């Protein structure tokens, strides 16, 4: 066991670093909810209405469902421990359509371009 005497980024109060990174993540979802992205990301904003498509096996495949509404909620509550976590659950729902739907299919194609803007948006992580 080794105690980290260097906390990477020494912050006053409690943990300024984590807050600044998560706030950037809020900036991301705020944009991903913007009407410009709503043209194609509309199915990801809210949990898919399974009745509408007439699926018969979402829970049988999708063991870790996530949606852009719920994820933002937890972010607003700041239950997220850092940026690594935020990126994980966003890619959760994106990869959900990927494994359950063939890569040439609609949702995964829409997610494909979301993944693009998302990847760049998450690349905007300052350290100091």
């Amino acid at each position: 066991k080794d105690v980290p005497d260097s906390q990477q980024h020494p912050a006053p109060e409690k943990s300024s670093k984590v807050s600044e990174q998560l706030k950037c993540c809020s900036g991301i979802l705020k944009e991903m909810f913007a009407k410009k992205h709503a043209a194609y990301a509309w199915p990801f904003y809210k949990p898919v209405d399974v009745e509408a498509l007439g699926l018969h096996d979402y829970c049988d495949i999708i063991k870790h469902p996530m949606d852009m509404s719920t994820i933002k909620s937890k972010l607003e509550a700041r239950e997220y421990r850092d940026a690594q976590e935020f990126g994980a659950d966003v890619r959760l729902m994106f990869s959900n359509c990927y494994k359950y739907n063939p890569p040439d299919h609609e949702v995964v194609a829409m997610a494909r371009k979301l993944q693009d803007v998302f990847e760049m948006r998450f690349a905007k992580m300052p350290d100091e």
Binding site: L55, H56, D57, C97, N101, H105, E106, V107
Partner: peptide, 16 residues
């Protein structure tokens, strides 16, 4: 019915 995936989206116009 096309089960086993999300075969039922509204992209442009599912017709042709």
């Amino acid at each position: 019915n096309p089960d086993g995936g999300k075969s039922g989206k509204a992209p442009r116009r599912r017709a042709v």
